[PDB]
Amino acid sequence: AVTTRQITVPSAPMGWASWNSFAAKIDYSVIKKQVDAFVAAGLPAAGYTYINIDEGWWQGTRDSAGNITVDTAEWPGGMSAITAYIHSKGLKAGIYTDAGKDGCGYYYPTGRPAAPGSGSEGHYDQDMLQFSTWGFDFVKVDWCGGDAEGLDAATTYKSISDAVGRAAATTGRPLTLSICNWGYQNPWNWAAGQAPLWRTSTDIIYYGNQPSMTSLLSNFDQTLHPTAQHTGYYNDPDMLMVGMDGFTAAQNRTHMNLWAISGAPLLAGNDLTTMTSETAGILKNPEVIAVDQDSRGLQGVKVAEDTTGLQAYGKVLSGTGNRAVVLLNRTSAAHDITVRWSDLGLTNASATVRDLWARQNVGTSATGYTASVPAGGSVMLTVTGGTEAAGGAYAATSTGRYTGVTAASTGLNVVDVAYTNNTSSARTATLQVNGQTATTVSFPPTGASAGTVSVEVSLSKGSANTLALSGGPATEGITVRPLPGTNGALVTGKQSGRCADIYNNTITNGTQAELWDCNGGPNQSWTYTSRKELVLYGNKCLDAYNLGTTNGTKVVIWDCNGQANQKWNINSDGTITNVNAGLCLDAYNAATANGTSLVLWSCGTGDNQKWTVT
């Protein structure tokens, strides 16, 4: 039963941004025409709110006092005239700068000559105040100057975040910060609490190229960091290509489906003045939007891939016994794809299946659902009225600390944190699960009675898990429920007692596996598939680098590719052998410390080649 209410958390931004269709070729007239089409197409009523002016508005000029100056031939009345227009339509206005001294308009001119000085470094407070005073409600802060200069992203964006907060406090106009650093330096580790959204990869489309499903899927895969997203903080797989030339209606729907299952921002990138009726309807589907904008704020995750390229993604929605599901077919042929209640963390009890594009209920089941999915296509469903897996309830054993937290398997869990915040402002806390990378959790106002917010966490098998909160409101208990489709295992070395680990939640192809203190994080939870793969993050395979067959071959993560160097035998003697050349997974030189490289080596009897994978 529902006995403590779920508190609604902020949703990801919805709106339109100028980059994908115009590159730097923007001025007042371009933005105005887009606003007018945005309004005429009924986007505001569907929830689209932001009109974001991206790169190209500012050529790097400043006056003697350091104030940003614009060319009023392109921006008549200055920047406050365009925010006034946007606001006159009941919408929010967005602007764009760089973390460094010079912006992407300098480093990578795209539609305009180089713009030296087009960054906010040395002017964070001045520029953020300027943007807010002009009337901007949103600011995207890029990384071209940060990358060029060699800046540290985490500390730099903390500085920017602080300046954003001060500017909004000074003017009284909230300022939504979009961190745009392309997944460099792993923003999923540090961006929550600094900003409501952070880019997780390079750009979905480069100017001059045609929209690509391959690129779309790559951005989607790279945005999946479920422990990082929660309570109004979102992974950002980039601006939509929905409606851009070359994309079919089916591709447009798939684009919406995958962004929605993530809970990603829906920032339209097409030319709204030539948008088809069908495209407008796809952007506006209220059922898909409701999934994207779900009040619980959680990120969808892969819950099954029984056959390569036939995938089920599930998202835990607001309320209890509710899920959204995307069935995705990455193969060259139409195939049936099944989602099981067990994988979704529901019991085998009746639930109702709804197709969100058909806008019709399509059946009931106590176990699962199967649909035919076209090659390269997807089906968008909800599964509602289900019964939740039993889960666990815990009371803090000391201030802000929950101990003895139990998981039947290593893998992802939903945690509902009970608390009271009887004030008018959200409060934040730091959350640390075991010895994992910490995160920030936001606690919205509750009124006088307690409520919950939810987070997804990765837990280790057993009852030694700890959740520690620092700062924020006193909590009043937690509930923990598993998502069994995400189940994996620690790969624990016998000699060392340490776990196969990819450093600091890095996803880059070629990153070498190492021993590290076991903590149960996503970078330690390996899923063994029927194809003999050991999979990390749902989408990276343990890999004998370049199909190496000799002693010392590096063992890395790489995109799963079906090759024999990504196949592993888990043997009765405790060894794990690479199928390609029959060598053993090996902690190099029988070292036991953090940072010990994993390699292939000729199999022997040494405990540095023995592992547990349960």
- Contact partners, residue 595, CB within 8 Å, separation at least 6: 514, 515, 516
- Determine how many CB atoms are found less than 10 A away from the CB of residue 128: 29
Q: What is the DSSP string of 148-196?
A: HHT--HHHHHHHHHHHHHHHHHHHS---EEEE--TTTT-GGGT-TTT-S
The response to whether 125 counts as a known ligand-binding position is no
Going by C-alpha positions, the residue among 418, 410, 366, 393 that lies closest to residue 481 is 393
Residue 256, φ and ψ in degrees, nearest 5 = -60, -45
Residues 13 and 90: their CA atoms lie apart, in Å, by 15
Tell me which H or E stretch contains 80. helix 79-88
The response to whether 36 counts as a known ligand-binding position is no
Give Cα separations from 70 to 78, 80, 118 (angstroms).
Answer: 7, 11, 11
- Resolved by: X-ray
The response to whether 140 counts as a known ligand-binding position is yes
**Angle of helix 249-262 relative to helix 213-223, nearest 10 degrees?**
10
Tell me if 56 sits within 8 A of 111, measured CB to CB: yes
Tell me which H or E stretch contains 527. strand 527-528
Q: Where in the chain is the domain with CATH 3.20.20.70?
A: 1-295
Q: Is CATH 1.10.760.10 correct for 296-386? A: no
The response to whether 202 counts as a known ligand-binding position is no
Residue 489, φ and ψ in degrees, nearest 5 = -145, 145
Reduced to 3 states (helix: H, G, I; strand: E, B; else coil), residue 232 is: coil
DSSP letter assigned to residue 583: P
231-247 as b/e: b if 16+ CB within 10 A? bbbbbbbbbbbbbbeeb
- Contact partners, residue 326, CB within 8 Å, separation at least 6: 257, 258, 260, 261, 300, 312, 313, 378, 379, 380, 381
The response to whether 180 counts as a known ligand-binding position is no
The response to whether 561 counts as a known ligand-binding position is yes
The burial of 295, by beta-carbon neighbours within 10 Å (0-12 exposed, 13-18 middle, 19 or more buried), is given as middle
Domain 1-295: homologous superfamily in CATH: Aldolase class I (3.20.20.70)
Going by C-alpha positions, the residue among 160, 152, 220 that lies closest to residue 187 is 152
The amino acid at 367: T
Taking phi over 0 as left and psi of -120 to 50 as alpha, with beta for the rest, 47 belongs to left
CATH code of the region 387-487 = 2.60.120.260
Catalytic residue (one of 98, 137, 142, 221): 142
The response to whether 501 counts as a known ligand-binding position is yes
Whether 137 is catalytic: no
The burial of 604, by beta-carbon neighbours within 10 Å (0-12 exposed, 13-18 middle, 19 or more buried), is given as exposed
Q: Where in the chain is the domain with CATH 2.60.120.260?
A: 387-487
Catalytic residue (one of 36, 162, 203, 271): 203
Whether 142 is catalytic: yes
Residues 501 and 547: their CA atoms lie apart, in Å, by 21
Q: From start to end of 434-493, where are the E strands?
A: 439-443, 451-459, 462-470, 475-482, 492-493
- Classify strands 475-482 and 392-394 as parallel, antiparallel or unpaired: antiparallel
Q: Tell me the structure's resolution in angstroms, rounded to a single decimal.
A: 1.5
Query: The tokens of 124 are what?
Result: 């964070």
Q: Is CATH 2.80.10.50 correct for 488-614? A: yes
